[model samples]
Target: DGSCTNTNSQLSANSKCEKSTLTNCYVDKSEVYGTTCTGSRFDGVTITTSTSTGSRISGPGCKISTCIITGGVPAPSAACKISGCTFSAN
Candidate 1:
């Protein structure tokens, strides 16, 4: 659904994670950084990233930190705020 800052103490650098609608998926205030994140055959996912130019969220759907999900479920989504973070894509 979203992202966060710093390192996660529970997960090793190469920890593995996955989830789906049927099986569903869930991660919390833990760390999955630099880990291999992927979905199963039935579910493809989009991820967020940043570059010198800017940051972008690319995928079918995405939710951010807290309850703020990308507007328009099951569709591409993105959004942004001044001096904060720009967001979008579903």
Candidate 2:
């Protein structure tokens, strides 16, 4: 049971982008920025969530570019990351 668990700790982590499927999700290196080192999810639209991390990013369209998600997933469970964007890892 836990075999595939390590691969995806959360439901969101199991989400993937399916072409032609409006209900999809994905996260990858930002081509515009030249890398996943950093990402911008649309200034005013990106929602700031309640994570003790100080500056936490969340909400739909967070992974819009690379992954078109159907939206409606749990916190942290359905979230994206910016490589050089700083998380619990600094």
Candidate 3:
């Protein structure tokens, strides 16, 4: 755990196959709390897996894809948007 500033402000967002989308597909924001919660507003930023990045899927099929997201102040929505790098998972 280096610096809290770097941890949250410059978080290395990631993703994990928490569970199957049998019941729910929405990811728990708590899982990626520091980064996801603090980063920025949900606007132009689109979410997807490494294999299929930029593909914005929604509803009860959202996987917990943590993006080491870097961007602006977040809005009153669900997720944030970043650039420079893309997110991946297994």
Candidate 4:
């Protein structure tokens, strides 16, 4: 439920990740509300959420690429590398 490391995994719908690391994961149509991915790295991952206010991914450190995110925002650190990703608003 918390502080779990997920690599090459899949999460969908009402998922929660806090202070954990997610690498190479696929998340779709989920509400990652209040997720604190601090110091976590999201590399080679794909996340797509519905156009809801509760769907979001919050963090400080991330390396995102080749991902598609809809109706959400991802806050990555300055050292992070984000490419080929899409971000939209509600």
Candidate 5:
């Protein structure tokens, strides 16, 4: 239920960032290799792999674009815009 805005920040592993907006950030692996970034928006962010398990970046009205995802799936919710992204299996 709270909101966070991060720019040019490096998020650690296993971080739960809900209702947040991240721009030009570097996100590391999370617990169970799953980083919970629900209800967030990512712009020009780089999301690293989660080892085995996947991560979650899905939520209503979440927007992501121009991001580089090393691994994991990003499922944005309704009214979201995700484009110009690069994904690779790690």
Candidate 6:
């Protein structure tokens, strides 16, 4: 098993597929939604939101598509292949 850090400065054995608030962390293939993500790393992860505030996501080489971004930090690279995702500047 590996380690996963969260926005709240929490570390776990690993991250799973679910909706949560994670900040300042890195994770593998997982779906994240409705969370204030900051300084996080996601590989092949899908981020979405239901609230009007959306999620604050910032990561390098993250795969995001078909979601709503209300506000948050901007991604470092243009590695986002967006389709159907309503984006807002951070």
User: Which candidate's TM-score is highest?
Assistant: 6
Q: How many clashes does each candidate structure show, in the order listed?
A: 15, 4, 9, 0, 1, 3
Each model's lDDT: 0.24, 0.23, 0.27, 0.35, 0.34, 0.43
Candidate 5 collision pairs: 14-30
lDDT of 6 at 43: 42
TM-score for each predicted model, relative to the true structure: 0.18, 0.17, 0.18, 0.26, 0.24, 0.28
Error of 5 at 86 (Å): 3.4
Worst 10 residues of 5 by lDDT: 46-55
Give candidate 4's root-mean-square deviation (CA, Å): 10.8
Which candidate do you rate higher for lDDT, 1 or 4? 4
Off by over 4 Å in 5: 1-71
* lDDT-sorted candidate list, best first: 6, 4, 5, 3, 1, 2
Q: How accurate is candidate 5 locally (lDDT)?
A: 0.34
- Residues 34-89, candidate 6: write the lDDT tens digits: 44555444444456432213232334434454333444333433544454232333
lDDT of 2 by residue, 1-90 (tens): 112121222213323222221111122221111112122222112222212111222323332222212222222433444322322211
In candidate 1 the C-alpha lDDT for residue 29 amounts to 25
Q: Positional deviation of 88 in candidate 1, in angstroms?
A: 2.8
Worst 10 residues of 2 by lDDT: 30-39
Q: Which is the better candidate, 1 or 6, if ranked by lDDT?
A: 6
Model 5, range 1-90, lDDT digits (tens) per residue? 123334544455434355434443344332111223332323333333211122233332223432333234434444223553322222
- What lDDT does candidate 3 reach at residue 50? 16
C-alpha lDDT of residue 86 in model 3: 29
**Which residues of candidate 1, in runs, are more than 4 Å off?**
1-55, 58-64, 72-83
Off by over 4 Å in 6: 7-36, 39-78, 84-90
Error of 2 at 74 (Å): 23
